[PDB]
Protein backbone atom coordinates (compact mmCIF):
# COMPACT_ATOMS: atom_id res chain seq x y z
CA UNK A 1 0.00 0.00 0.00
CA UNK A 2 1.58 3.24 -1.22
CA UNK A 3 1.46 6.55 0.65
CA UNK A 4 -0.59 7.88 -2.28
CA UNK A 5 -3.23 5.16 -2.07
CA UNK A 6 -3.29 5.28 1.71
CA UNK A 7 -3.97 9.02 1.51
CA UNK A 8 -6.72 8.43 -1.07
CA UNK A 9 -8.33 5.82 1.18
CA UNK A 10 -8.34 8.31 4.06
CA UNK A 11 -9.82 10.94 1.72
CA UNK A 12 -12.91 8.77 1.21
CA UNK A 13 -13.86 9.44 4.85
CA UNK A 14 -13.15 13.18 5.00
CA UNK A 15 -15.69 15.98 4.56
CA UNK A 16 -14.97 18.69 2.02
CA UNK A 17 -11.85 19.04 -0.10
CA UNK A 18 -8.32 20.40 0.41
CA UNK A 19 -8.94 20.85 4.15
CA UNK A 20 -6.21 20.74 6.82
CA UNK A 21 -7.28 17.14 7.46
CA UNK A 22 -6.57 16.28 3.84
CA UNK A 23 -3.08 17.71 4.25
CA UNK A 24 -2.72 15.81 7.53
CA UNK A 25 -3.82 12.60 5.79
CA UNK A 26 -1.09 13.09 3.19
CA UNK A 27 1.58 13.95 5.76
CA UNK A 28 0.72 10.97 8.00
CA UNK A 29 0.45 8.60 5.04
CA UNK A 30 3.97 9.41 3.91
CA UNK A 31 5.41 8.97 7.41
CA UNK A 32 3.51 5.72 7.98
CA UNK A 33 4.68 4.39 4.63
CA UNK A 34 8.35 5.23 5.27
CA UNK A 35 8.14 3.59 8.71
CA UNK A 36 6.99 0.29 7.22
CA UNK A 37 3.63 0.79 8.90
CA UNK A 38 1.15 1.83 6.21
CA UNK A 39 -0.87 -1.33 6.85
CA UNK A 40 -0.85 -0.99 10.64
CA UNK A 41 -1.81 2.68 10.34
CA UNK A 42 -4.76 1.86 8.08
CA UNK A 43 -5.88 -0.92 10.44
CA UNK A 44 -5.62 1.44 13.44
CA UNK A 45 -7.58 4.08 11.56
CA UNK A 46 -10.29 1.56 10.68
CA UNK A 47 -10.46 0.46 14.31
CA UNK A 48 -11.13 3.99 15.49
CA UNK A 49 -13.82 4.51 12.83
CA UNK A 50 -15.51 1.31 14.01
CA UNK A 51 -15.79 2.82 17.48
CA UNK A 52 -17.93 5.66 16.15
CA UNK A 53 -15.29 8.30 15.68
CA UNK A 54 -15.25 9.94 12.29
CA UNK A 55 -12.11 10.52 10.26
CA UNK A 56 -11.13 14.05 11.36
CA UNK A 57 -10.96 13.09 15.03
CA UNK A 58 -9.51 9.66 14.22
CA UNK A 59 -6.60 11.33 12.40
CA UNK A 60 -5.78 13.84 15.12
CA UNK A 61 -6.04 10.98 17.62
CA UNK A 62 -3.63 8.85 15.56
CA UNK A 63 -1.26 11.77 15.07
CA UNK A 64 -0.73 11.87 18.84
CA UNK A 65 -0.72 8.12 19.64
CA UNK A 66 0.58 6.08 16.68
CA UNK A 67 4.29 5.41 17.25
CA UNK A 68 5.46 6.40 13.77
CA UNK A 69 4.27 10.00 14.36
CA UNK A 70 5.61 10.75 17.82
CA UNK A 71 7.95 13.74 17.97
CA UNK A 72 8.16 13.99 14.18
CA UNK A 73 8.66 17.55 12.92
CA UNK A 74 6.28 18.80 10.20
CA UNK A 75 7.47 18.84 6.57
CA UNK A 76 8.21 22.15 4.87
CA UNK A 77 6.09 22.68 1.75
CA UNK A 78 7.29 25.33 -0.69
CA UNK A 79 4.79 27.78 -2.17
CA UNK A 80 5.10 30.89 -4.36
CA UNK A 81 3.09 32.72 -1.71
CA UNK A 82 0.44 31.91 0.87
CA UNK A 83 -2.29 32.54 -1.69
CA UNK A 84 -1.15 29.14 -3.04
CA UNK A 85 -2.32 27.41 0.16
CA UNK A 86 -5.80 25.95 -0.48
CA UNK A 87 -8.74 28.15 0.52
CA UNK A 88 -10.06 25.71 3.17
CA UNK A 89 -6.62 25.81 4.87
CA UNK A 90 -6.17 29.60 5.01
CA UNK A 91 -7.88 30.16 8.35
CA UNK A 92 -5.72 27.48 9.95
CA UNK A 93 -2.42 29.21 9.11
CA UNK A 94 -0.33 30.42 12.06
CA UNK A 95 3.06 31.90 12.81
CA UNK A 96 5.54 29.03 13.17
CA UNK A 97 6.09 28.14 16.87
CA UNK A 98 9.52 27.36 18.45
CA UNK A 99 9.33 23.57 18.23
CA UNK A 100 6.46 22.38 16.04
CA UNK A 101 5.68 18.67 15.96
CA UNK A 102 2.93 16.78 14.18
CA UNK A 103 1.74 15.23 17.44
CA UNK A 104 1.01 18.72 18.78
CA UNK A 105 -1.26 19.70 15.88
CA UNK A 106 1.29 21.21 13.52
CA UNK A 107 0.60 19.58 10.17
CA UNK A 108 3.17 21.28 7.92
CA UNK A 109 5.13 24.49 7.47
CA UNK A 110 4.48 26.48 4.31
CA UNK A 111 7.50 28.42 3.09
CA UNK A 112 7.17 31.19 0.54
CA UNK A 113 9.72 32.09 -2.13
CA UNK A 114 11.40 34.50 0.31
CA UNK A 115 11.43 32.13 3.26
CA UNK A 116 8.45 33.69 4.98
CA UNK A 117 6.77 30.83 6.82
CA UNK A 118 3.40 29.81 8.24
CA UNK A 119 2.46 26.62 10.03
CA UNK A 120 -0.81 24.78 9.42
CA UNK A 121 -2.54 24.18 12.77
CA UNK A 122 -5.11 21.47 13.49
XYZ file of C-alpha atoms in Angstrom:
122
model
C 0.000 0.000 0.000
C 1.579 3.245 -1.219
C 1.460 6.552 0.645
C -0.588 7.885 -2.277
C -3.229 5.162 -2.066
C -3.293 5.278 1.713
C -3.973 9.017 1.512
C -6.722 8.434 -1.067
C -8.329 5.816 1.183
C -8.342 8.313 4.056
C -9.819 10.940 1.718
C -12.912 8.767 1.214
C -13.864 9.438 4.846
C -13.149 13.178 5.004
C -15.691 15.976 4.559
C -14.970 18.694 2.022
C -11.845 19.039 -0.096
C -8.322 20.404 0.410
C -8.936 20.853 4.149
C -6.208 20.743 6.817
C -7.281 17.139 7.456
C -6.565 16.276 3.836
C -3.081 17.714 4.249
C -2.718 15.814 7.528
C -3.818 12.602 5.792
C -1.093 13.088 3.188
C 1.579 13.948 5.761
C 0.717 10.972 7.996
C 0.453 8.600 5.039
C 3.975 9.410 3.913
C 5.414 8.970 7.413
C 3.511 5.724 7.983
C 4.680 4.387 4.625
C 8.347 5.228 5.274
C 8.144 3.595 8.707
C 6.995 0.290 7.222
C 3.633 0.785 8.898
C 1.145 1.834 6.213
C -0.873 -1.331 6.851
C -0.852 -0.989 10.638
C -1.813 2.681 10.344
C -4.759 1.863 8.079
C -5.879 -0.921 10.441
C -5.623 1.442 13.439
C -7.581 4.082 11.559
C -10.289 1.555 10.679
C -10.456 0.456 14.308
C -11.127 3.992 15.490
C -13.819 4.514 12.830
C -15.514 1.312 14.006
C -15.795 2.821 17.478
C -17.935 5.664 16.148
C -15.291 8.299 15.677
C -15.255 9.945 12.285
C -12.108 10.523 10.260
C -11.127 14.049 11.361
C -10.960 13.094 15.027
C -9.506 9.663 14.218
C -6.604 11.326 12.403
C -5.778 13.839 15.123
C -6.035 10.978 17.617
C -3.630 8.848 15.563
C -1.258 11.772 15.073
C -0.725 11.868 18.841
C -0.717 8.120 19.644
C 0.578 6.082 16.685
C 4.287 5.410 17.252
C 5.458 6.401 13.771
C 4.273 9.997 14.356
C 5.607 10.754 17.821
C 7.947 13.739 17.967
C 8.159 13.991 14.180
C 8.662 17.548 12.923
C 6.282 18.800 10.204
C 7.472 18.842 6.573
C 8.214 22.153 4.873
C 6.093 22.677 1.747
C 7.292 25.327 -0.689
C 4.787 27.780 -2.172
C 5.101 30.886 -4.360
C 3.091 32.724 -1.713
C 0.441 31.910 0.869
C -2.293 32.537 -1.691
C -1.154 29.140 -3.036
C -2.320 27.406 0.162
C -5.802 25.947 -0.481
C -8.744 28.152 0.524
C -10.059 25.707 3.172
C -6.620 25.814 4.870
C -6.166 29.596 5.009
C -7.876 30.156 8.353
C -5.716 27.482 9.948
C -2.419 29.205 9.109
C -0.326 30.423 12.060
C 3.064 31.902 12.807
C 5.541 29.028 13.167
C 6.086 28.136 16.866
C 9.516 27.362 18.448
C 9.329 23.567 18.226
C 6.457 22.381 16.044
C 5.678 18.674 15.959
C 2.925 16.785 14.178
C 1.743 15.226 17.442
C 1.006 18.715 18.779
C -1.262 19.698 15.883
C 1.294 21.208 13.517
C 0.604 19.581 10.172
C 3.169 21.276 7.921
C 5.131 24.488 7.474
C 4.480 26.480 4.309
C 7.499 28.419 3.095
C 7.168 31.192 0.542
C 9.716 32.086 -2.131
C 11.395 34.499 0.309
C 11.427 32.135 3.261
C 8.449 33.692 4.981
C 6.775 30.835 6.824
C 3.403 29.809 8.235
C 2.461 26.618 10.028
C -0.815 24.784 9.423
C -2.544 24.175 12.768
C -5.114 21.470 13.485
